[PDB]
Amino acid sequence: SDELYRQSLEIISRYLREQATGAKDTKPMGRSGATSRKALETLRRVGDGVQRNHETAFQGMLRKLDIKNEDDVKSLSRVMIHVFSDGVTNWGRIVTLISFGAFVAKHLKTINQESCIEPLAESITDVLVRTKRDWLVKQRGWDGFVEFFHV
């Protein structure tokens, strides 16, 4: 029973699969579906923006990770943990994480490997919920996230 992990995995998996397939998973949202939806919109705008402002960096990182199969998607946990846990915990870091997640998912759809898009998301979630939990709790979670990127 980890609501934070549940909603996080929902939003993240939805965004990473939507960024790849190009289609919107119109399936009904779970609990706090309003927050999840708004979070998905925020991630759409801000996330795509980040993917456009850091194309070179994401491309080079993807080239360096060399993700060709599911075992690689399993192994990238350590490096992800190392690079992400820079100690500096800001929402821009999170959005960067999920956006590169989406980039990687796109590549994983380019290569015949949509089968790896779902576990990847989990890994991402598994990091964000473990490394920066108490922080996320203190920032009112996704409710803060949305409220942070309001224009």
Ligand X SMILES: Cc1c(-c2cccc3c(CCCOc4cccc5ccccc45)c(C(=O)C(O)O)[nH]c23)c(COc2ccccc2)nn1C
Interface positions with a copy of itself (CB under 8 A)? 1-5, 130-135
Question: Is-contact 82 75, C-beta < 8 A?
Answer: no
Least Å from the CB of residue 23 to ligand X: 21
Sort 73 into a burial class: Cβ within 10 Å, 0-12 / 13-18 / 19+: buried
Q: What are phi and psi of 86, to 5 degrees?
A: -80, 5
- 38: which 2 tokens? 């708004």
Least Å from the CB of residue 83 to a copy of itself: 17
Q: Give the residue with the Cβ less far from ligand X, 33 or 92.
A: 92
Chain positions contacting ligand X, by CB under 6 A = 54, 57-58, 60-61, 64-65, 76, 79-80, 83-84, 86, 93, 96-97, 100-101, 104, 124
Q: What residue 96 binds from a copy of itself, ligand X, none (CB within 5 to 8 A, per partner kind)?
A: ligand X
Question: Is-contact 12 120, C-beta < 8 A?
Answer: no
